Design a protein around this ligand. Structure first.
Ligand SMILES: Nc1ncnc2c1ncn2[C@@H]1O[C@H](COP(=O)(O)OP(=O)(O)OP(=O)(O)O)[C@@H](O)[C@H]1O
Ligand SMILES: Nc1ncnc2c1ncn2[C@@H]1O[C@H](COP(=O)(O)OP(=O)(O)OP(=O)(O)O)[C@@H](O)[C@H]1O
Ligand SMILES: [Zn+2]
Ligand SMILES: [Zn+2]
Lengths: 458, 87, 241
């Protein structure tokens, strides 16, 4: 019975994992439909009331159905990606922590910097009996024992890795094993590794994409209390469409420079505000009636807000909005003030922003062109130029599609991993040993079959 | 070389935030598992002992809903601790 | 059809002025500066529409009272008392305004939401007026640069490699004017076109041995008779030199 409930749960997990992406698209479509409906949403006026104004009259139930559907789809888009992308994240982190144990002595000789959330949290998974649950290397604990026990102590490293000392020897001497039935009560509760699940949940909660999906679900829930919270789901186009991401990378490529340019603009406008407050106060009267003046630069804060909010947005600068200087003793000084403000703030800094965006476009295009040129002129593995192979017609294509194919190397790694170690050939054992040692000298570098047998082949 | 020698001559002879986040994680996940790591699960499953695909799917959804609520509590606790260490 | 309709209304002849794009080569570079990234331009306009819709939602939920566009207090003209009207007002007025929507909505001074509406206006001006329009300008400029780079790449490839065999120009340049002689006398693509025409127009029964060989591979669409990485000079390098 339990073996059947597990099968049904696995079927549901597989369904959601398969349909994760399609349903993200469905959520985006439903959000767009909800916002299109909301475009016909008026206010009635006492406390004002928000009401749909439509001749058809039936998009209120349509909106309610769409909101319920969006919430359901968001929940399902959490369950999916939990069935699909969480295993990959867990695998990656397990691989990283295992290799930092083996090749760096992270928790043996180094210890985390005490400010790294990942390093501090990963201390829990070491002691778990199911540490490499997703990572293939199930012998990482034994390898760490072999590498570090002889200097840092068998017993202490075994305590660090949560391994048993005398139980293995006693079982070898006498098996002394009794059968267990998982259908019995508390059997699953005893089988599940509580500490490992703790660490896994911590990793999932720290994952950024899962947090984004949780925020999406929370906004969908809030959309039922207020239908305008569904507008927040229109921001999902950035993370849903690849094509929009080039345009958005044009902005985010130099985002730090953009922020620094805004800060520099703020500083320059503050300097202009100081000058105006010290010398040009009388020109900042923004009241048409002389009975009650409205002086905008009688205070530092008000004058700075006036500048930042009005002069920057003005086409000709602050002079477009402050009093005319003709006939005044400070006419030349205020003319210089206005002209310099217009040149430095309106003309130059905004030009800096435009140039940052244009340069981001150009830099991304150049990076793509560089990738294309490198891939077309050099082999990805050995790095030999294309001309040497092109001495033979179609030589580079043949070499990169038949001899040094990175897809073929990936397939070989998969074949070695899935193949039994006892069934390895000599070459397979050699490559497997260097792979476990993480020595990449078996990858050809500057040499190939053609180069080494150039005399005999040609 | 000159500036190196001069420097040698003149040379003569976050944690709170990460700790709060770790504590919030541990506390919230412990609260989440305190309702899944006890023996009352038998007396709750006595009602769902029948096959009832509908109830199996309901429980399957409820587990993920509980996980999501635990994350919401964790985020709230993180914000509370971050404001407390601000103040 | 437009020419025919021009007799019913003479202003249908203005539609024929669009023929300059398809008639003048020179205008087509300028127009390719726009059509090269047309998909990105359309997507940028859509993103601008979405951002302005978000701003409209915020204004309709919090800043309704600032959208009175009537000079006389007797009859208010509220432009953001409806979602559709408020969105049209934004898209039609704030985008075209130099300083954004704040140029056209009521002054916020003295209000409880003064800081919030100041942030609203400044962010609208920065994201819509300054950045997205800059994205459009950058798309056009990048199209110019990309087309120029493509033309330069064509020129460099044609001047540095033979179109048929692909051997670099330096090897032929070991002999003075070697690349020019090779590309104008030995591996001329015009000569290859002329040979294909000659084979097609020549009777099959009158083909020589080489002509029959090339004709058979042409009918089989096998392009192994085109030299690739080899040439007369390379194969007879010892005897010729
Ligand atoms: N070691 C290598 N393995 C594979 N391709 C290589 C290698 N070195 C250079 N290349 C070059 O990289 C390019 C690979 O082409 P590419 O991956 O774009 O095509 P594809 O397999 O049809 O699919 P896709 O266009 O979707 O990526 C080819 O031009 C190939 O010559
Ligand atoms: N196989 C090839 N056949 C012809 N030209 C080649 C070949 N390989 C390289 N080239 C180069 O391509 C260029 C051809 O010049 P191009 O076609 O521009 O001049 P054109 O015949 O005077 O006429 P037009 O400028 O109108 O096209 C030359 O620089 C030539 O060296
Ligand atoms: Zn290679
Ligand atoms: Zn040639």
């Amino acid at each position: 019975f339990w073996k059947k409930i597990i099968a049904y749960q696995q079927k549901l997990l597989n369904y959601f994992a398969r349909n994760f992406y399609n349903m993200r698209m469905l959520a985006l479509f439903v959000a767009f439909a909800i916002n299109f409906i909301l475009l016909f949403y008026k206010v009635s006026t006492i406390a004002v009331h928000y009401v749909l104004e439509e001749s058809s009259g039936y998009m209120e139930p349509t909106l309610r159905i769409l909101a319920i559907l969006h919430t359901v789809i968001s929940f399902f888009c959490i369950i999916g990606y939990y069935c699909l992308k969480v295993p990959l994240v867990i695998f990656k982190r397990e691989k990283e922590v295992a290799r930092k144990l083996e090749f760096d002595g992270l928790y043996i000789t180094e210890q985390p910097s005490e400010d790294d959330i990942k390093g501090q949290w990963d201390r829990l998974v070491i002691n778990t009996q199911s540490f490499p649950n997703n990572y293939w290397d199930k012998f990482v604990k034994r390898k760490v024992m072999d590498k570090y026990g002889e200097f840092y102590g068998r017993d202490r490293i075994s305590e660090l890795l949560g391994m048993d000392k005398a139980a293995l020897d006693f079982s070898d001497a006498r098996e002394k094993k009794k059968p267990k039935k998982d259908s019995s009560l508390s059997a699953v509760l005893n089988s599940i590794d509580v500490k490992y699940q703790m660490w896994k949940l911590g990793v999932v909660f720290t994952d950024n994409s899962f947090l984004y999906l949780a925020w999406y679900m929370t906004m969908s829930v809030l959309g039922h209390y207020n239908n305008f919270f569904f507008a927040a789901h229109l921001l999902d186009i950035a993370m849903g469409f690849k094509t929009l991401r080039t345009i958005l990378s044009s902005v985010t490529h130099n985002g730090k420079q953009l922020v620094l340019t805004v800060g520099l603009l703020a500083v320059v406008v503050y300097l202009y505000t100081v000058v105006a407050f010290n010398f040009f106060r009388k020109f900042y009267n923004k009241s048409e009636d002389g009975d009650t003046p409205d002086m905008k630069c009688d205070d530092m804060l008000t004058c700075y807000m006036f500048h930042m909010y009005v002069g920057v947005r003005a086409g000709g600068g602050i002079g477009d909005e402050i009093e005319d200087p003709a006939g005044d003793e400070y006419e030349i000084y205020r003319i210089i003030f206005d002209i310099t403000f217009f040149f430095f703030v309106i003309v130059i800094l905004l030009a800096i922003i435009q140039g940052l965006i244009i340069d981001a476009f150009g830099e991304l295009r150049d990076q793509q062109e560089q990738v294309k040129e490198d891939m077309e002129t050099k082999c990805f593995i050995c790095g030999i130029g294309n001309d040497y192979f092109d001495t033979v017609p179609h030589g580079f294509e043949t070499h990169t599609l038949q001899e040094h194919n990175l897809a073929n190397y990936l397939f070989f790694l998969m074949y070695l991993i899935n193949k039994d170690e006892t069934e390895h050939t000599g070459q397979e054992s050699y490559v497997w040993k260097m792979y476990q040692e993480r020595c990449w000298e078996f990858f050809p570098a500057g040499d190939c079959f053609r180069k080494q047998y150039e005399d005999q082949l040609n | 070389i000159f500036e190196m020698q001069l420097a040698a001559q003149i040379s003569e002879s976050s944690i709170l935030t990460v700790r709060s986040a770790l504590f919030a994680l541990r506390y919230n996940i412990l609260t989440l598992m305190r309702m899944l790591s006890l023996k009352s699960l038998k007396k709750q499953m006595k009602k769902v002992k029948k096959m009832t695909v509908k109830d199996m799917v309901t429980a399957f959804f409820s587990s993920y809903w509980s996980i999501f609520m635990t994350l919401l509590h964790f985020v709230a606790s993180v914000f509370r601790g971050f404001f407390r260490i601000i103040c």
